[PDB]
From a paper:
Although neutralizing antibodies are elicited against other parts of the spike protein, the receptor-binding domain (RBD) is the dominant target of the neutralizing antibody response. We isolated a panel of neutralizing anti-receptor-binding domain (RBD) antibodies elicited upon natural infection and vaccination and showed that they recognize an immunogenic patch on the internal surface of the core RBD, which faces inwards and is hidden in the “down” state. We observed a continuum of partially overlapping antibody epitopes from lower to upper part of the inner face of the RBD and some antibodies extend towards the receptor-binding motif. Class 4 anti-RBD antibodies mainly recognize a patch of the molecular surface conserved between SARS-CoV-2 and SARS-CoV.
Our cryo-EM structures of the spike-Fab complexes revealed a three-RBD-up conformation for the complex with all these class 4 antibodies, because only in the open state could their epitopes be accessed. All bound RBDs are in the “up” conformation. For FP-12A, the footprint is focused on the N-terminal half of the linker (residues 369–377), like that of 3D1128 and S2A4. FP-12A showed a one-way pattern of competition with EY-6A but blocked the interaction between ACE2 and RBD. aEY-6A and FP-12A were isolated from two COVID-19 adult patients (Wuhan-Hu-1 infection) in the convalescent phase.
Numbering used by the authors:
A (entry chain B): 336 to 529
B (entry chain F): 1 to 224
C (entry chain G): 2 to 111, 113 to 216
The structure:
Amino acid sequence: CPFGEVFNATRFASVYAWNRKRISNCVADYSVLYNSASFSTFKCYGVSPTKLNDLCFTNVYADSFVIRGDEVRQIAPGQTGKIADYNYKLPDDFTGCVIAWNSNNLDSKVGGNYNYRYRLFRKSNLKPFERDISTEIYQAGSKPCNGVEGFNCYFPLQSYGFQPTNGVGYQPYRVVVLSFELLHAPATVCGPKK
Amino acid sequence: EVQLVESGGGVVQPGRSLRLSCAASGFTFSSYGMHWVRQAPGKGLEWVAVISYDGSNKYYADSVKGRFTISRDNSKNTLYLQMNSLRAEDTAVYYCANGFGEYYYYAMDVWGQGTTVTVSSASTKGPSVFPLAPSSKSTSGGTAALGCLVKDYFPEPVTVSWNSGALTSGVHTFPAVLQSSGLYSLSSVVTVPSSSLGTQTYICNVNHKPSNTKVDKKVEPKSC
Amino acid sequence: NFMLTQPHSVSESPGKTVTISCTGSSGSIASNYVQWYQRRPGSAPTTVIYEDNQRPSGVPDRFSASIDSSSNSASLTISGLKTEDEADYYCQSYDSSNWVFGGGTKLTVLQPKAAPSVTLFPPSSEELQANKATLVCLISDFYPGAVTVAWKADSSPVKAGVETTTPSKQSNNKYAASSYLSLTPEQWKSHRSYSCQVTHEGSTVEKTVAPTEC
């Protein structure tokens, strides 16, 4: 039951490069979800957490990434905005739970981290199941750009500053998301069921 | 469906500890979590401690930790909450509650009858009755306020009445407070016209028959 | 540090819209669940709503609640109030490693509601040599018979507040309660006087007293 192995990962990827660790063909004890005292948020959308153990899933998933602290409340169905469109779009029929916890004392640097980057602006919402690793140059105007800033040539790459003088909303946080799917296939993962 | 019985000691004198148990009967204790929470008089529910299913997680408030301990025993199918270093602010009513559902401890489901634990001393003596001088000063107000009061009495209650035809006297209860200069006080109100400007003198008739100790004093006017 | 402020009571005319709100601040209240509880007088607490969307077995269909994302607060509504539904309700929430219980908004389904009156006399020199001081503010014949007294002396609260248990007096079935305290002489001598503010209902006409001291 190697969920703690995912929990204690030393390094985390960028927000645009969220990694999916496939969970299948393993009996899920789900003991890690009990110790919620160390978890900042514990909520589920489209699924009843009480009936998680009593029902069996054909396949299950777990996704881990790092974002800022104040973005926890924006991870909800029916929400719009730049973060909800160009970073991660939640379908109205999403079935899963969103879990995050404090990591400022472990994932913050005095000089500021320069490892998590993404794309600030894009023309439209990301198509489903797309890995947004594109670094296209933003060009609002009709004047062509030669890769160097100038007349109507704005560099779309910006860096964040993690400093002690910053507020609470600049703190780094660990985020882990679990999604359970029930396709037109028989169940393969079952709880211990006492 | 869910029935809980609690047994143990009640009133305890300072110097010794108390054995408190919340025995489990009628439900599978070893499958559900248990908790102990405090409900101070007047105030709402206040968290004190929480114990996980295996007991490895014991959390306490920062300002009270070190002395207050929580415990449980799955082998004996019973509950124990050992209280250490009890103080004057720890006097309240206790209850044992199990978590809502299995492996969830963010909510409370069932509360038993509970047990009463007190750390104090009983004096049960001294009326210390002082007359309450009438004071109306009716400048077109027609207001008169007076009553009979007793301080530091035990056991409750005290029978005070106007012992006449009228039986609608506004009697009051006593505040049993054990923190922040809590002093017992009894009061009553009688609706009379402005004829109490020193014309009719009222004597509060209190006779502590079980103790044979009475305090009676004259009523003196105001000074202004 | 996680203190909460709620209205003492709320009342609306029959046929209007009524709801019970426990509005928190200094953090989103929809981030975690809020649990609804019912505390009948003299009865053990019983859950009537859990996780804001489900009802235990036997709970009447008139009980419901949800979350309004516009203001980010938890609202509990009950339609068709009945005598059997009278009890005490409080909100619930857990923050990190401790559990915080809100003050709660009282819902009562009851007759007359005449405004109360205040009678007070602070030249009680007889009791001055027994204890520090004691203000007398007698309140009776007030509906509902559960009123609590909140005082902020100038800009600092007073810790001497004393509350009774508003017992029902004999067969009258009415209520009688009062609020006393040990008051510093400086409070009512520097200013012109000291008043007893009573929270009964939304109908407050004057709430003014005209004492004439010697």
